[model samples]
Target: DSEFPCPRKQQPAGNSECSYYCEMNGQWKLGKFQNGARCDYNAVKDGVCNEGLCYASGDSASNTQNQGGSRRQENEDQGDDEWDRK
Candidate 1:
């Protein structure tokens, strides 16, 4: 079976899980994306991979170290610039 020592490439940061589908032992397995790897798909390169899992802003997940610094700055234009409109 055609196989590689390890995943040498990561999947495109486009609608993917921020990983590479590597073939090992004739089995296709997901190789987690390295740290700082792009995780955004068809969008801005805002998110990245952390310990093989996709971070926020691209995929649905949890938070990182801090509340704002660790995550991307959501600069969406709003009406009152308030936290909520309700």
Candidate 2:
């Protein structure tokens, strides 16, 4: 569960790097990352970007990590519809 189940603004285009990890099929499907940031899961689906959509990263059945620690920005979006799992 290496996902910080959180939604955040896409890093500015100029950002040099991002880190990505999405849990799928009960396993953390490591995705590509830029600027050491997790891809916005709640903001997209099927690798496409959208808004106002919430996405779940993982469950207890799977292994969990600290969302990669400080590398993850926990307070990007509101938890009302999104979760910043650290």
Candidate 3:
């Protein structure tokens, strides 16, 4: 942790100087995340922007940290209805 509250409203969460961690949520210490942040966004589909770091969704850190996250369905607009297929 850095000690005081983090900056906000101006820059993005992942917009750090060292390019090591990020600032997220309301009030969390710091240097906690792992997957890193991408301007309040996650690069990896299985990533999370925590304190001032990233969550790789594959971390066995604490109770909140877990490798197995959720499952997502792909190919949405394609539709599964009867089409031109034979």
Using Cα atoms with residue i matched to residue i, what is each candidate's TM-score against the true structure?
0.36, 0.19, 0.22
> Top TM-score: which candidate number?
1
Best lDDT among the predictions, by candidate number: 1
For candidate 1, what is the lDDT?
0.53
User: Model 3, residue 54: what's the lDDT?
Assistant: 36
Q: Candidate 1 has which clashing residue pairs, if any?
A: 14-41
Candidate 2 per-residue C-alpha lDDT over 1-86 given as tens digits, one digit per residue, 9 for 90 to 100: 35445334344564323433556568754344322242344234223222223223432235767566454556666454555464
Output the TM-score of candidate 2.
Answer: 0.19
Candidate 3 positional error at 38, Å: 5.6
lDDT of 1 by residue, 7-75 (tens): 445554235445566777798765554545545432554665544455555445556665444535555
User: How much is 43 displaced in model 2, in angstroms?
Assistant: 28
Stretches off by above 4 angstroms in model 1 are 1-5, 12-16, 41-46, 50-53, 57-86
Q: With candidate 1 superimposed using the best TM-score fit, by how many Å does residue 36's alpha carbon deviate from the native?
A: 2.3
Q: What C-alpha lDDT, on a 0 to 100 scale, does residue 63 get in candidate 2? A: 72
C-alpha lDDT score of every prediction, in listed order = 0.53, 0.40, 0.42
Residue 22 CA displacement from its true place in model 2, Å: 0.9
